[PDB]
Predict the 3D structure of the following.
Amino acid sequence: MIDRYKHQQLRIGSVSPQQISAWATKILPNGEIVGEVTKPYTF
Amino acid sequence: RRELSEGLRPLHETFLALVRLFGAKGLATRGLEILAAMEKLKYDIRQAWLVLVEELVRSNHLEDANKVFLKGAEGGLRATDEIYDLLIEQDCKVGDHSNALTIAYEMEAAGRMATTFHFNCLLSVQA
Amino acid sequence: RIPFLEEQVRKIRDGGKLLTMDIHRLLLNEDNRFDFVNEIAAEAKQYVENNRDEYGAKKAILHVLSNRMNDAGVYRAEAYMESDPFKP
Amino acid sequence: QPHDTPASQLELADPDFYKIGYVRSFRAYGIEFREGPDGYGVFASRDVEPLRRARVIMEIPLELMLTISKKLPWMFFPDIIPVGHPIFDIINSTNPETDSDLRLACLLLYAFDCKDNFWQLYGDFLPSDDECTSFLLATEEDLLELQDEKLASTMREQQQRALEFWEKNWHSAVPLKIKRLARDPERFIWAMCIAQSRSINLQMRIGALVQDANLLVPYADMMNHSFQPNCFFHWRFKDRMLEVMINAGQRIRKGDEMTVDYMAGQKNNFFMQRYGFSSPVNPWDVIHFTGDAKIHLDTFLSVFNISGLPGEYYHNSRLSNDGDSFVDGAIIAAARTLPTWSDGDLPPIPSLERKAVKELQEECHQMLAEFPTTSDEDQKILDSMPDCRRTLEAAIKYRLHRKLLIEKVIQALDIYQDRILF
């Protein structure tokens, strides 16, 4: 009797200063890079 | 077509020879129509299907052979142990694991359980 | 042959205790009680995918169980539905 | 008017036969047991339409049957032999591979001498020494009348072995516990005959132990034999009950004869050796040909509509039904035993097959004349004796079936030689 052989591997690790940019940096219509917070007051 | 035009159903040996010739030439798509013609004539398409898959395997046509085997297995047609072994051996020697695992599942569902040989082939592709 | 025994028989047939016996009888031929549940769920899904409204009398699971009990020689109602004829 | 059914010719059995089992946990659904001259049989009393799954017709509990394991540690799951009884020394002093009927016979003899046991009440329905068809209870005259030297030699050797076992185990210095079991040497022979003609080998599971054992089950030995069966035995481990279930898809009408398969895939000689039964439509009986003539196999299967793999030959009715009523088990056995040749898809030559069919026919004629008698003479002898011994009846039926198989092979060869040229 062969099993179904389900394989799931949850991996953890410390992020790199290059991979951190892949989360917040998004594209825009004009092309300006956005994703940085530069103002202290939010509202 | 000449024999069929006069309103006479052909024999089983003629259809078997036609299926063997179409399988030796690699023309897999032209064998399913012959199998359907045998089915509409109230024949049995088990031995013809086995001859088709065996001749497709022996003629260096593996993908179409596995396709024909999977198409015939879903319809309730079981196969011999020798074909079950040959398909797995060839698919593992080529490097195809998906079709080998599907054939192994169909084999275990039909009634024959896997032996060491089968698992060994699968492990070869896995390692 | 006890004479005064029809009342509890009618109570069993009406309250719905037949299903509790049928489930236990069907669990006498299967090794695992989980593969049986999976098979019944798959059969009910296949029967409800064909005809949505015509899943049976009321539901599909009861219909599947009634079909499985009627193929073994035990007459059962359609999806275990028997209305009360004495309701004004 | 009464409906003409194969079950209507027989009369209903004694209601005590079912009453002695219904008091236990025995049930029989949609079945009616009917006794005739040959013996009891199980028939149907309700039209069973083609079902998607099997339907149970018998539920026989474990505490109603005997059981002896096939391996070396002899475990009797229905514990009826107390520890210390000297019958276990007789059961244990046997070869664990060649003689398994001796242990079943000893267990049956002991069960016949134990109170509150079901077999003390069921033994009244078992065949006696005059209505049994086994060849152990036969004479030298009937064995010589069989016209088969090897089968007669085997039966004589088996009778000798039974007598020697009884003489070696039931001597004079034996305690009375064993002596009262089989006082006469015929009782042990009858016990062996019952244990050999009614045993069923089935892999049973109780608790966590899965083993194969030889069990004598009541109410299931009444099932007749048929090479196209309708039912099969199934073991239910949740309740420790054996089931007889109809096959899935087969249509059973009222009055049909419920049958199972005894020794599926065996020659017609072992049937006569064990059960004392012979059938002319056996699809596995072998006919030995010494000639070198070889007929064509694929054309022979195509002309008789025998479609299927060499392991499973069936007649395809939807190809030809009325046209081919000749197609029975005999032609299948012929196609399995005929010397055949096949070289790819090369078409056969009519001259070669026409020259081979006559050689096969003359070989069949020279092998048929070896018997001292003929077919019509045995056919008249079988019904010339209205009430004769069962062994002589079985022997004359065996000879008649052999001759009828030879004649059927000859007629099939004639049909093949005259129908190959359409």
In short: Chains B and C do not touch (no CB pair under 8 Å). The helical segments of chain B are 2-5, 12-24, 29-40, 46-58, 62-73, 81-94, 98-110, 116-126. The CA atoms of residues 67 and 99 of chain B lie 9 Å apart.
